[PDB]
Design goal:
The complex is a heterodimer of chains A (204) and B (242). Chain A is mostly beta strands and 204 residues long. Chain A is 2% helix and 48% strand. In chain A, strand 4 and strand 5 form a beta hairpin. In chain B, a hairpin with a 6-residue loop joins strand 4 and strand 5. The chains are: A mainly beta (204), B mainly beta (242). The PDB classes it as immune system.
Chain lengths: 204, 242
């Protein structure tokens, strides 16, 4: 009978913003509600547990409310960090049942704030003796999205944030490669909306 | 201190039996089995209070059985596995006094039609561009793992024999080498970025390691290629002075 709903299914936010995650449940006869965080392909970590009679609970930058009669819970995350990127799951335990009934989760991504963008596309050659290389699109700001290729023989990854922690430096990147003859890093990301000032380097 | 599960992965052919073991946090009287598929939330399997199995998903097949003989550890057995059994199998425990659930890292079950589609990754490391070095005074290495199936891999970076996390990022999901087909092999990339000065020291050693969770030694294999067993495939680069 119990149906637990989470919206939004997916959330992308700039680092530093507060954020709001919603949980709904059709049956108010709950005993508690628990929020978890999941790093995908691993297990869940309990974040907060709110008793049916409690209205709130907080832990560090995390705060959650419960309105059992409305069948709602809200999770608030203050000053988001890229390390908050994860799946956030809501679950309820019912009166006179031991099991937790889970929602489907919110997939959260906190995009890094890029201080000094320097967008460029570089060609990288195999360390092992071969004809192989890849194209690296890097140093673009987090507003830039990396699209898939018009050509199906061309492989392009989604964007990815790395953190050079000691340098207080974060950077975005995506990788493209292909076995086809006419493939070049100058054209690899042609279908993406990229900055006009993107740097394309000359002969190596 | 934490919930433990053995094994981390298991590939199985249809019809085979599989057994997972879970060890709760010391003395926790309550133990739960759940399973989860990608993009969704956990679905309840069974509940134990000490040794007794008090609640079980009404819809779950009789092929699924769990036991917790002395309390403490519990096993989950699936008989004659079907493709639909494919999921992460999660174990959780709770103490009698608090409602907080503590989860294990999970047991990933992939039940396949035929084992001939199973392939380990090939791995290659691509060295930093001289143009990147000139432009940014930084140096990005790329590791690419290609042609693996199913997608049971963990990629890690090792700098001079030490695992690094700083300056690393790995694609959240592998891409399909043929996005249409159901049994397409996969590819996954990762970047490691270091200072140009670090890259330019020829004594510095960079290794990308890809752990593949594949077939066991009890699995039957009659193909000419190497049995795609659980393995590590790696590639490496050394710094270059310029």
């Amino acid at each position: 009978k119990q149906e637990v709903t989470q919206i939004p299914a997916a959330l992308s936010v700039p680092e530093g913003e507060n954020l709001v995650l919603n949980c709904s449940f059709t049956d108010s006869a709950i005993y508690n509600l628990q929020w978890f965080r999941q790093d995908p392909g691993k297990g869940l970590t309990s974040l907060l547990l709110i008793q049916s009679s409690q209205r709130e609970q907080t832990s560090g930058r995390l705060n959650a409310s419960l309105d059992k009669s409305s069948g709602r819970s809200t999770l608030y995350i203050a000053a988001s960090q890229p390390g908050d990127s994860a799946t956030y799951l809501c679950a309820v335990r019912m009166d006179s049942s031991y099991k937790l009934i889970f929602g489907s989760g919110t997939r959260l991504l906190v995009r890094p704030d890029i201080q000094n963008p320097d967008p460029a596309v570089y060609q990288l050659r195999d360390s092992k003796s071969s004809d192989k290389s890849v194209c690296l699109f890097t140093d673009f700001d987090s507003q830039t999205n990396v699209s898939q290729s018009k050509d199906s023989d061309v492989y392009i990854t989604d964007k990815c944030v790395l953190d050079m922690r000691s340098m207080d430096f974060k950077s975005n990147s995506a990788v493209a490669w292909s076995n086809k003859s006419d493939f070049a890093c100058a054209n690899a990301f042609n279908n993406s909306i990229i900055p006009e000032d993107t740097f394309f380097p000359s002969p190596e | 201190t934490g919930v433990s599960q053995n094994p981390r992965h298991k590939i199985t052919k249809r019809g085979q039996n599989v057994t997972f073991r879970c060890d709760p946090i010391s003395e926790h009287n309550r133990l739960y089995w759940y399973r989860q598929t990608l993009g969704q939330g956990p679905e309840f399997l069974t509940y134990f209070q000490n040794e007794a199995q008090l609640e079980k998903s009404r819809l779950l097949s009789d092929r699924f059985s769990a036991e917790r003989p002395k309390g403490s550890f519990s096993t989950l057995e699936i008989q004659r596995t079907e493709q639909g059994d494919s999921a992460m199998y999660l174990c959780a425990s709770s103490s009698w006094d608090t409602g907080e659930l503590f989860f294990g890292e999970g047991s990933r079950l992939t039940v396949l039609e035929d084992l001939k589609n199973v392939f380990p990754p090939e791995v290659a490391v691509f060295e930093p561009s001289e143009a990147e070095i000139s432009h940014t005074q930084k140096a990005t290495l790329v590791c690419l793992a290609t042609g693996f199936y199913p997608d049971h891999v963990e990629l890690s970076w090792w700098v001079n024999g030490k695992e690094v996390h700083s300056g690393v990022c790995t694609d959240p999901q592998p891409l399909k080498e043929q996005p249409a087909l159901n049994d397409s092999r996969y590819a996954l990339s990762s970047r490691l970025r270091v200072s140009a000065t670090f890259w330019q020291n020829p004594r510095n050693h960079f290794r990308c390691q890809v752990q593949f969770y594949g077939l066991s030694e009890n699995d039957e294999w009659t193909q000419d290629r190497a049995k795609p067993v659980t393995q590590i495939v790696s590639a490496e680069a050394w710094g270059r002075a310029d």
